[PDB]
Design a protein around this ligand. Structure first.
Ligand code: VW4
Length: 185
């Protein structure tokens, strides 16, 4: 892919974060805390899962960013509608306004309904996410493996502004404490 020149500077929006997340001062890193992080509740916060949105909203054009997933056992990454449900249980699917991939229990899967098996030969330490709003495209690239394609959602019905989407995952095992990091341009 030659998508790097659509690079955008993504920062995390503290106000959307699950109350157990810790977002770094520079708003470029997020990790699961050991407890509630002493913030007030609000209608923006994801209640049931360790999720947070980027601050940026996209309604046109081509956008690209990269995320470091080094040493994590579980995570979800991609984009979602600004209007996604925040409270209670829900599945990550395009019908619910999410275009995502994830790692769970040693397998990679795309957030279709039902979910799709990914075929990755080189476990990625960094993921590239490309959105073409007009084309209706969300693509994922394996930066560790020379930028190889992971998955393309096409014919996407965004149906509103999009936000970068993150899930640091649970840490029940004690092996998933590591942060998600937005990598420099
Ligand atoms: C209780 C856990 C923390 S952990 N480390 O994943 O066990 C949890 C926190 C926030 C949202 C959902 C779940």
């Amino acid at each position: 892919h030659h998508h790097h020149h659509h690079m955008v500077h993504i920062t995390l929006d503290r106000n959307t974060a699950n109350s157990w997340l810790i977002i770094s001062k520079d708003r470029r890193q997020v990790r699961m805390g050991d407890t509630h992080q002493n913030v007030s509740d609000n209608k923006e916060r994801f209640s049931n899962y360790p999720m947070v949105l980027g601050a940026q909203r996209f309604s046109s054009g081509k956008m690209y960013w990269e995320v470091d997933v080094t040493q994590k056992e579980a995570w979800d990454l991609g984009v979602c509608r600004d209007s996604v449900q925040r409270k209670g249980q829900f599945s990550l699917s395009p019908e619910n306004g999410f275009w995502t991939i994830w790692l769970w229990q040693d397998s990679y899967e795309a957030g279709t309904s039902p979910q799709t098996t990914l075929h990755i030969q080189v476990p990625p330490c960094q993921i590239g996410i490309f959105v073409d709003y007009e084309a209706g495209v969300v693509s994922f690239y394996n930066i560790t493996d020379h930028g190889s394609l992971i998955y393309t959602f096409s014919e996407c019905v965004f149906a509103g502004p999009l936000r970068p989407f993150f899930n640091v995952g649970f840490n029940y095992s004690g092996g998933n404490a590591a942060p998600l990091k937005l990598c420099p341009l």
